[PDB]
Design a binder for this molecule. Structure first.
Ligand SMILES: N[C@@H](CCCC[NH3+])C(=O)O
Lengths: 291, 291
């Protein structure tokens, strides 16, 4: 049921790396004003990895408070420990989050059965809608369509963020499932095509700097308007490319800085976008009319 | 500079997941007895990602207590947060660890420069020998030989665990380093080859079940006795392959259970060795004279 443009929102930071609450606040308000359908708080793009548990809670709480029930909020609550994922997802629920996005355990490479048992355990432990999140390139594991299909049987497992960018496989996944659970794109550059094939939305990086354009692209692709989905995407297709010239969220945070929306803060081991890409990005933002 | 067989020790668990302190004590004792040259406490093989911070500290504490200065203890203290890694590495230092092993930040994909700044920051914050650890298949990031050479200039960065299993690449690493830091194998199958090439040791998974054998293999290869290192390694070569039928430490823990040394405990998302693999493992263990 949650659909359209879902922004994986950055966690604005002060020069020293402290969370910049006033920028965070303005961003959320802007996304709501601009058309953004919902926000994933503290996901990969929001630097889940470098924020303390206390900061995860603080950030989730502020985004919910500022949203004021106008759009649904998803809390990023993934962990590579089943026990810890349970704790983070429970905390998200108690905070009133509408759903939780859970990346597959990264680094420790669990088996498919383990991924199955991991998710099942969380779903039975916390009574909240859970969205799976597969991004093999970052985690070391690949949650198969088959395993996702098995998980779709659990009532509170309501979707999956497929960041593979493998359109054929995403379509295969969509078809293998029925409205059993939703499928969200996690790859901005092929998102439009995924939604045209039935995905319910796009958990976007690009929606961070072009919330309305992406808002529109999703509405149109979900309505199966291929031609208008193609020409509305072409206008921002370049953005989809440069926002990953270095690992996300490095580029998108610098973009947001060139837009005057946030400061340069960014936490190690991540680093400020290398000088090498700042100008080509400034030009990409101009070419798209962002600035 | 630590040299030889360095066991990446498992952390024994009771059926319900609780750390089996008694078995751990017995294993540490056994390793010292059998010829193990060093122990890595709470590394990947020790399920560092599913142990609480307190259990982390406790495992290091116990291993150090039992070892009683007989052999150097390395503490696994890697994190994908620079702040977090410094905290864990200071802790290890204050606990009496001889060095710390830090895997490259996983999941969040820092740049090469981010990797350099991450490790540099930790080196300067904690006066303790640090060993880098590159295992691209688990982390989603590959610390290049160039970035390694850079880091080797730093006084207390004393070594690198190269888990690529790419010997020619390791040859190039050993050569480019000009001795500035040690190189350790993180791939049991090719460890004897990397050591014959100049590696100072093997942070081994196999040493968990064949410590006497891996200890001689290491000493002989480090001495550059190619014929004896090959024939000694040939006797345990099938183990290096079987111990990875599923993701480590899933197989080595079960092997150790078949040996009657530990219980079946393992924490989700990890799972006990799949049935189909238990017998073949038992046989390899029998052929190697372990069982
Ligand atoms: N630590 C080893 C274990 C994985 C087991 C593969 N089946 C690695 O990085 O590859």
């Amino acid at each position: 049921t949650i659909q359209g443009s879902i922004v994986a929102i950055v966690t604005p930071m002060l020069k020293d790396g402290g969370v910049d609450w006033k920028s965070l606040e303005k961003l959320v308000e802007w996304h709501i004003e601009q058309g953004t359908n919902s926000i994933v708080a503290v996901g990969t793009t929001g630097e889940a990895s470098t924020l303390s548990m206390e900061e995860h809670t603080q950030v989730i709480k502020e985004i919910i408070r500022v949203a004021n029930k106008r759009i649904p909020i998803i809390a990023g609550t993934g962990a590579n420990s089943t026990r810890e994922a349970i704790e983070l997802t429970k905390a998200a629920k108690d905070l009133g989050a509408d759903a939780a996005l859970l990346v597959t355990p990264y680094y420790n490479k669990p088996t498919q059965e383990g991924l199955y048992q991991h998710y099942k355990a969380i779903a039975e432990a916390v009574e909240l809608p859970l969205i799976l999140y597969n991004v093999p390139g970052r985690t070391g594991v690949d949650l198969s369509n088959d395993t996702a299909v098995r998980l779709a049987e659990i009532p509170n497992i309501v979707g999956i963020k497929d960041a593979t960018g493998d359109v054929p496989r995403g379509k295969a996944l969509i078809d293998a499932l029925n409205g059993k659970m939703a499928v969200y794109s996690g790859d901005d550059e092929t998102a439009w095509e995924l939604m045209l094939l039935g995905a319910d939305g796009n958990i976007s990086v690009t929606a961070n700097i072009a919330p309305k354009a992406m808002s529109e692209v999703c509405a149109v692709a979900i309505a199966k308007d291929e031609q208008q989905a193609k020409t509305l995407n072409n206008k921002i297709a370049n953005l989809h490319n440069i926002l990953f010239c270095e690992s996300n969220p490095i580029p998108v945070k610098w973009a947001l800085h060139e837009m005057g929306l946030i400061d340069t803060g960014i936490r190690l081991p991540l680093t400020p976008l290398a000088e090498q890409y700042r100008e080509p990005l400034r030009n990409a933002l101009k070419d798209a009319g962002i600035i």
